[PDB]
Amino acid sequence: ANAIAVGSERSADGKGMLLANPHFPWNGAMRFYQMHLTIPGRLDVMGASLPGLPVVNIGFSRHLAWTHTVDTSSHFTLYRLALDPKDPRRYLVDGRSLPLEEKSVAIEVRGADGKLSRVEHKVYQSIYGPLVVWPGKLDWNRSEAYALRDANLENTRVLQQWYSINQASDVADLRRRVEALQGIPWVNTLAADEQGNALYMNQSVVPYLKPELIPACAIPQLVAEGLPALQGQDSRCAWSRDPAAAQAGITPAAQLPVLLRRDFVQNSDDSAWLTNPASPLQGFSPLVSQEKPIGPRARYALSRLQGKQPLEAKTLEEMVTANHVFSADQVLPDLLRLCRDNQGEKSLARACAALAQWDRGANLDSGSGFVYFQRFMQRFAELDGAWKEPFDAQRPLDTPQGIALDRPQVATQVRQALADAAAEVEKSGIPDGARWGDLQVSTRGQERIAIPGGDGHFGVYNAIQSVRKGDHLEVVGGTSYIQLVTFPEEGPKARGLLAFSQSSDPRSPHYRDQTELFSRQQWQTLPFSDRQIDADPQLQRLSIREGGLAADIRWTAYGVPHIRAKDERGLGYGIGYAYARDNACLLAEEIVTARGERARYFGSEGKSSAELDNLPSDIFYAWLNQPEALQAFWQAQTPAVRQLLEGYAAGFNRFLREADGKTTSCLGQPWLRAIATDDLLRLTRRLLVEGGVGQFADALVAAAPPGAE
Numbered sequence: 001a002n003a004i005a006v007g008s009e010r011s012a013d014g015k016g017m018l019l020a021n022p023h024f025p026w027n028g029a030m031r032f033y034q035m036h037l038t039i040p041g042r043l044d045v046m047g048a049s050l051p052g053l054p055v056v057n058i059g060f061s062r063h064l065a066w067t068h069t070v071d072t073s074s075h076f077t078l079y080r081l082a083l084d085p086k087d088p089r090r091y092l093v094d095g096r097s098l099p100l101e102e103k104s105v106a107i108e109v110r111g112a113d114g115k116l117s118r119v120e121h122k123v124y125q126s127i128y129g130p131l132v133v134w135p136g137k138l139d140w141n142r143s144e145a146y147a148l149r150d151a152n153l154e155n156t157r158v159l160q161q162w163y164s165i166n167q168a169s170d171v172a173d174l175r176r177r178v179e180a181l182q183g184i185p186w187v188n189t190l191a192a193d194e195q196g197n198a199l200y201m202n203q204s205v206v207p208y209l210k211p212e213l214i215p216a217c218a219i220p221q222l223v224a225e226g227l228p229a230l231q232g233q234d235s236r237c238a239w240s241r242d243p244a245a246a247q248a249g250i251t252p253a254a255q256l257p258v259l260l261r262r263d264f265v266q267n268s269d270d271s272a273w274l275t276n277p278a279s280p281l282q283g284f285s286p287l288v289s290q291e292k293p294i295g296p297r298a299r300y301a302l303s304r305l306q307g308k309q310p311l312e313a314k315t316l317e318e319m320v321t322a323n324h325v326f327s328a329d330q331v332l333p334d335l336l337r338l339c340r341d342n343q344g345e346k347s348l349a350r351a352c353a354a355l356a357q358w359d360r361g362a363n364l365d366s367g368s369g370f371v372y373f374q375r376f377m378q379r380f381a382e383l384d385g386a387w388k389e390p391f392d393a394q395r396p397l398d399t400p401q402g403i404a405l406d407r408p409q410v411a412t413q414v415r416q417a418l419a420d421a422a423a424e425v426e427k428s429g430i431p432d433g434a435r436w437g438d439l440q441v442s443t444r445g446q447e448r449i450a451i452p453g454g455d456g457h458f459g460v461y462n463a464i465q466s467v468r469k470g471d472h473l474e475v476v477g478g479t480s481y482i483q484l485v486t487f488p489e490e491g492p493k494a495r496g497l498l499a500f501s502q503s504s505d506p507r508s509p510h511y512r513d514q515t516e517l518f519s520r521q522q523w524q525t526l527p528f529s530d531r532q533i534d535a536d537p538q539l540q541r542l543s544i545r546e547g548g549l550a551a552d553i554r555w556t557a558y559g560v561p562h563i564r565a566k567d568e569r570g571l572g573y574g575i576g577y578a579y580a581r582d583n584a585c586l587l588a589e590e591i592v593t594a595r596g597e598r599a600r601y602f603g604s605e606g607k608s609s610a611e612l613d614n615l616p617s618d619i620f621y622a623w624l625n626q627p628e629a630l631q632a633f634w635q636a637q638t639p640a641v642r643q644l645l646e647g648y649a650a651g652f653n654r655f656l657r658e659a660d661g662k663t664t665s666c667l668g669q670p671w672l673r674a675i676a677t678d679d680l681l682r683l684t685r686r687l688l689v690e691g692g693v694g695q696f697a698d699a700l701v702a703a704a705p706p707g708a709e
């Protein structure tokens with residue numbers, strides 16, 4: 001993700017300004033969806049959110065605009081256990097042997113001959129949490145095993161937190177509602193408001209260890225691999241329980257980085273350190289924020305944001321639509337000198353020509369040099385001492401830079417990496433003179449739409465991640481919801497797109513209408529006031545009831561629903577109905593995943609949208625969403641949240657009762673069925689653990705002791 005909040009001192013109009021550009025999948029449980037929610041007098045906020053959630057995750061209201069980026073804090077800890085030398089099913093805490101908890105789950109699998117079979121798996125849990133095995137790496141042998149405590153497994157405030165965010169009026173109000181509830185799982189928060197404040201917050205759920213305990217409790221080699229690993233045989237290494245924290249064992253708000261400014265704040269998924277170099281954030285816990293080099297996306301943003309010139313909204317827009325490969329600025333000059341110097345080797349002929357013609361961009365009409373440059377960087381990045389100016393912690397904006405072509409070995413190393421990378425390119429039969437837009441596409445039914453942008457690792461702000469599928473590169477994630485908000489006196493003027501369009505269903509009119517506009521990088525008005533909404537020639541209005549539940553739904557262009565209701569139940573009613581019309585098949589599938597029933601419907605020869613095999617994914621979510629977990633989670637929800645969720649499941653089921661396949665391709669499938677509120681709790685918890693134990697779902701299923709059946 002990228003995010004830039006400009007305050008009154010740097011904005012051309014003297015008011016707040018926010019650029020929101022998260023990078024998320026183009027399919028599955030994390031596919032963003034535009035919506036505008038309104039409960040008159042209490043709630044009116046527009047933006048985008050994740051499937052199944054009756055709140056807005058990134059958006060804006062009349063005086064405020066906020067967004068999220070991934071942070072560098074830890075949201076879980078790996079605990080290395082010391083096993084009882086006489087029983088690998090027992091572990092030691094301060095030298096005392098304790099039994100491992102044993103919990104059985106059962107899964108149903110549909111065989112090839114349609115028959116059903118039951119699979120039972122045992123999950124072992126320590127006082128820290130479930131045991132995980134990364135075979136070969138985090139083994140369960142006779143002296144040690146590994147457990148994983150996910151801090152968000154105990155976060156029941158997650159939906160209450162965003163619903164509170166949706167009611168925030170400005171930056172001060174926003175800062176209060178997040179600090180008080182501490183419900184954000186694993187993202188930063190940046191925001192601007194009409195009065196010209198710019199806010200950055202590393203306010204999330206972070207395990208708490210007092211600073212003096214960290215050098216002793218941390219495992220150095222594993223922390224060196226970026227893993228938050230603690231000693232699990234020492235009671236002094238349990239998470240510290242500060243009574244000022246909203247959840248037992250997490251870091252209280254006052255210790256997490258916050259920066260309020262009137263010039264600007266930015267973040268492109270690095271630590272809080274360089275949110276604004278004029279005001280560095282240092283001296284925090286290493287579980288919270290370290291002073292490490294920033295990625296090229298942040299360097300690009302900071303280079304363009306330097307100085308004191310007033311910024312226009314189109315300047316923020318063009319920082320994305322430019323598709324500038326910022327990493328070439330540090331490598332391409334030296335690389336082209338090498339290229340001309342070696343105008344003899346006929347091998348390097350094609351690559352050097354493409355690199356010389358390359359416009360240093362990732363646009364649709366950018367030359368094939370971008371492909372050559374990409375493969376070169378992958379092999380240049382695995383070479384120590386190749387940077388002429390290596391990283392200097394005192395110049396982290398200008399460093400590293402340049403190729404040290406002066407030394408004899410690196411010169412022939414860089415020439416070797418270029419020669420290797422060039423061979424890989426022509427080994428794929430890519431035509432001569434092919435442009436980037438001819439290669440990177442997004443499949444829409446039977447056709448392909450060219451998608452500009454490139455992978456963020458190369459400093460492309462408009463980060464686009466794709467994989468090779470057949471004769472092209474299929475876009476899999478990246479720039480999703482785009483939001484650029486300013487605050488003229490008339491009202492919030494917002495402008496953006498949903499790159500993959502509102503509906504994942506090919507039958508829908510909103511399956512590729514915004515993807516075509518993204519291909520041409522034509523951002524559109526996001527209508528918020530009733531004047532813009534009601535003056536749309538494409539407006540469609542409809543009221544629905546049952547019971548009770550009622551909602552007033554307006555649809556503007558590209559299928560963006562605007563839901564008006566009297567209470568949370570009716571608000572959820574409209575949300576569930578509108579989202580089902582666009583994405584009923586997506587949610588039906590993801591609910592089957594979060595229920596642990598993929599092998600029941602699709603058999604064991606399949607994968608989930610998370611590229612997890614059907615059987616291990618089922619075992620994990622059966623453990624994660626067992627009924628005791630759902631009951632305990634539900635009983636911890638505020639009444640408003642429970643009414644939102646109840647309304648959603650009703651609005652979803654209301655559409656299924658009327659569905660005739662017009663915008664629903666999975667009509668007739670046995671897994672397309674009415675949903676309950678607990679199904680929505682499963683999707684929520686599935687998203688919660690995505691910053692922690694969810695990333696270890698296969699490792700949890702793999703954990704078995706020596707012996708055992």
Ligand SMILES: CCCCCCCCCCCCCC(=O)N[C@@H](CCC(=O)N[C@H](Cc1ccc(O)cc1)C1=NCC[C@@H](C(=O)NCC(N)=O)N1)C(=O)O
Pocket residue numbers: 001002022023024050057058068069070158185187225226268269270294295296297298456457459478684687688
């Ligand atoms: C109920 C719950 C509801 C939740 C509601 C959530 C609503 C908010 C949505 C969040 C949107 C952010 C997603 C997003 O925007 N991710 C990005 C993540 C991008 C990313 O983080 N990319 C870097 C590499 C990088 C960094 C800086 C650059 O400038 C360029 C590249 C990285 N990726 C892999 C992990 C990590 C790493 O490995 N480094 C540690 C190490 N030791 O090396 N860093 C991506 O999905 O694309």
